[PDB]
Curated annotation (Swiss-Prot), chain C:
A GO-annotated cellular component: host cell nucleus
The name this protein goes by in its record: Triplex capsid protein 2
Subunit-structure text: Interacts with TRX1 and major capisd protein/MCP.
Keyword annotations of the record: Capsid protein, Host nucleus, Virion
Lineage top rank: taxon: Viruses
Species for this entry: Human herpesvirus 2 (strain HG52)
Recorded GO MF terms: structural molecule activity
Amino acid sequence: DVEFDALLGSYCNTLSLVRFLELGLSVACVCTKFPELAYMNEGRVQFEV
Amino acid sequence: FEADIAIPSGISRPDAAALQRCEGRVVFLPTIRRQLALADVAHESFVSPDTLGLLLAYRRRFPAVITRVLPTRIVACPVDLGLTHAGTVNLRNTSPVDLCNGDPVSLVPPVFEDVRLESLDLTLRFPVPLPTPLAREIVARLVARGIRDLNELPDLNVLYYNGARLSLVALASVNTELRSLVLNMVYSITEGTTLILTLIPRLLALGYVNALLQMQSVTREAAQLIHPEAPMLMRRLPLYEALVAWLAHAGQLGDILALAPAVRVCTFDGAAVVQSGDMAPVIRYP
Amino acid sequence: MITDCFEADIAIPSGISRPDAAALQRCEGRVVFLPTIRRQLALADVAHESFVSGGVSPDTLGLLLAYRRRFPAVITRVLPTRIVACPVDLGLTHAGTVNLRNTSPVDLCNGDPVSLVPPVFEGQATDVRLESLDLTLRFPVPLPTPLAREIVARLVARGIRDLNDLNVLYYNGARLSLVADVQQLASVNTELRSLVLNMVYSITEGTTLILTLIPRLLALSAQDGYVNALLQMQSVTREAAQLIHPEAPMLMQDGERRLPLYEALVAWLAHAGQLGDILALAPAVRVCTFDGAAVVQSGDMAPVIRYP
Amino acid sequence: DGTGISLHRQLRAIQQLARNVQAVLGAFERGTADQMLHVLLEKAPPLAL
Amino acid sequence: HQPLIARDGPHPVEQPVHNYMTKVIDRRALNAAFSLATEAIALLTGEAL
Amino acid sequence: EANRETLDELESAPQTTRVRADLVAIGDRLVFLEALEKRIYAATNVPYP
Amino acid sequence: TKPLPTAPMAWAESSPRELAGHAPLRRVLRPPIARRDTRATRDDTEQAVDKILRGARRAGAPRYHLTRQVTLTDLCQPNAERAGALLLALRHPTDLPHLARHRAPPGRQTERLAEAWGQLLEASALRAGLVSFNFLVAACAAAYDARDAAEAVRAHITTNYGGTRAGARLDRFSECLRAMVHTHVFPHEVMRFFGGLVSWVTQDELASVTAVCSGPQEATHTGHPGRPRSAVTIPACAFVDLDAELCLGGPGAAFLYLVFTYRQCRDQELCCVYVVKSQLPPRGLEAALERLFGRLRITNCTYAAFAELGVMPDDSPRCLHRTERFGAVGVPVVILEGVVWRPGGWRACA
């Protein structure tokens, strides 16, 4: 007598890497980066009309 | 280990200088987390409660000594966790009692007399770090004062510690403030000492519990029973369903009025006595 | 590490069928009572066979009394050869964070202390039995402590009824009843003795000054909604003042130099405030989850900080 | 140990980091697009008003 | 494998997740009947020939 | 690598013939739209499930 | 320094898997996440700085908290008592004559503590100070049973402690202690555990005492690197086991406890200091105080008051019984070995 058990194929996934600037939403952002934001206290912007 | 408390924007010059003052004064935070808003710390987060609710609040919340205060955020080190990691944290007195070396320190709600930030539009009250032998008396004296207003004494306004006099008077608000402890301390004894009075005459269990009790209650409780039952007396009374309701209430106040020490003091290369206003080194873990 | 943890090791025996091995790995964070703080033990010393007394199996009310003569340890990792457990009574971890597991049907909140209780509930007495080793295991139940003060309060109070319903609770709107069971009269006498000693010692000469203030209270619970919600529907003082008008002795023996009420409070806390810990065991553990939520639900692990 | 199994269980444990770090770093790009909506919405009144 | 999107406080901090299932094979059979007849057996056998 | 060629992918393409069916485009996707009961199930006693 | 015990030698210098833990972390690879697929001195001062610089090249061991406290030397003497004794701190003394007026039960002398302590300031001159442990044993020596070694403690105190007639302070400080119990201001509410002796620096009238408020005992920087060891010594009148007296021969970690006994009678009041070793939980201790010290419970309503002291972490706790020489007097002293100090609070049992 001969018997046995089998595994058939395993299956993974792939996490999709979403890059933000790919989205159409990247319009609304203007992204400039500080290397150091932390040290800064209140910063500002000036609007003249 | 340390947690961080961000200050919301719009901070004035004296209100930022108000937070510069309370460098090492104790803050209760809800849960240990990295980002943690300053509205969780403030007295708005405690709803205002009286001094029974503040004893209830300090057990569910997590005590944490503020370390250095940055302009952007307030950094605080928790007692239960980040003091097992970081060694020793400087702690500023706000008590009128000077701390000796080796004192287990507990914190007490401010019953006696409150930094308020106006631009952020919130208040802060801080606990009072005074030692645990005084803490179990000063709570008990203010209840003993409170019962006598419910009909005081010539003394009991006076306490001595380290040869120094304390003034518990410094009073009309305080008696209204601590009144809910009084209504629970009066109640817990009265339903306490009426279940005893209704159960010792009920059984006097015959075996050795009978001879052991009344011989030990000889002129201690058996005299005090008939001295009560002189101005007292001896359907179905709900005698057994009330011990459930009594032990649940009496074990509830035992957690409150314990005032467990969160802090011990091992000073090294310093004074054995830390005076008021000064900072004391604080550990609790070996 | 010797001072920080203390990894007490229960050794697993040799002959274990792989189902009974896979049962113990399902017991990752449980509660195990040690008799000593030895670093080398066996499952026979942990299990219910070491728990049974001479000839007589203990009931649930005695099952408390032989918990508090032991050392509660939390299993931290179940190895294939042995079981690693850390006792609570010494010190929990280096960082002080142990994972327990709610076997209860009751969720926990953050900052609730955790008192543990035998399997008192109905449909709950789940003992992992190893048939290849002939060992059952009573893993006790972690609870929030106002349940664990009320559950022990139901078991003592039912025990005094048998010296001559009550078995229904509520907690956060959930109706749960506990197992009604026969009780050993030897064990209930120990709980009965611990009431009478602790209640009488809380009686002082200042208490009769307080008992004069009972007609003040019934005059006051007719005015406050707070005190009217305080006394109860099932109080005794509302009955023992409508039949009883007490009065004090007018002068006291040296009542000026000493404080008659202040000593009554201190004596009351040392005997009646302590009393919930004398019947049950102590809450040496509370819940401080870091970043998840306020509430750890049933069946799910909860981190643990040491707690006086 | 001097075994191959020990060496094999690193490799299973090392490639467990890759499964995480990748799964994490991605959560920041998907994280920004989450803030922007939470930002822009707070800026925006309803048309009907 | 399930991904993350990193949120802010006070929302709890989620971790990468991993899901492993293994399905068991389900087995069946089919049937068909070929039946012959007697005098047909004798022919093919070569007998009645 | 958390990313590999799935072993399932390395087989050569099978042979293909040209078979008749009905490929309907519903929304964005092709579908065989097929009703068997004439092909299979015809002229038997077997119901059509 | 590169020996030939090369198997576990790397493990004691902090290991072999630590280089393996640094192999997948530091040795390999380009990850975090990667892509797809002048004869004697100088060099003596030069090797002095080299003895400093080797400490800067690098940076197991447990942690301590050393405590220093400058304390006058009237009652306690760190000079006579060697390194490794208990130390008990005190409160402030001027709160004593006022708190006796209030906590006293009616019918007792409130003005006894104000005069008994007043004759010790007038006896120690012949301010939260310190009282060491061996000084305290001879004061309560009149209430210990063998009494042969309770008088041996009293023998080396009158002859070796700094101070003129410390035995006159002994019959005064025990009279102070017998004034504590009568005036109801109990001595357990005053005594505070301070650490074990590691070093002390004396001067005129005072000393700078250093101790260990938390941690183990045996590895402290004593101050003298010739003898960096210190063992705990307790005289045999105060040392009380509970494992042999109840046939508890099972091994395990052992705990240490301070225990006070009270005896409230009309002008027959005793004091005793005990140091109990047990394997019992602190919740399961008062039943043992009922068993041995229910004798004074019948005569007394607090009768005992205890406090934790520390833990022997051994599975087999180790004791010794020798007679050390305190100057010229040999006292039977129980030696405890490997004690990890963890303090605690007090307890009342009315």
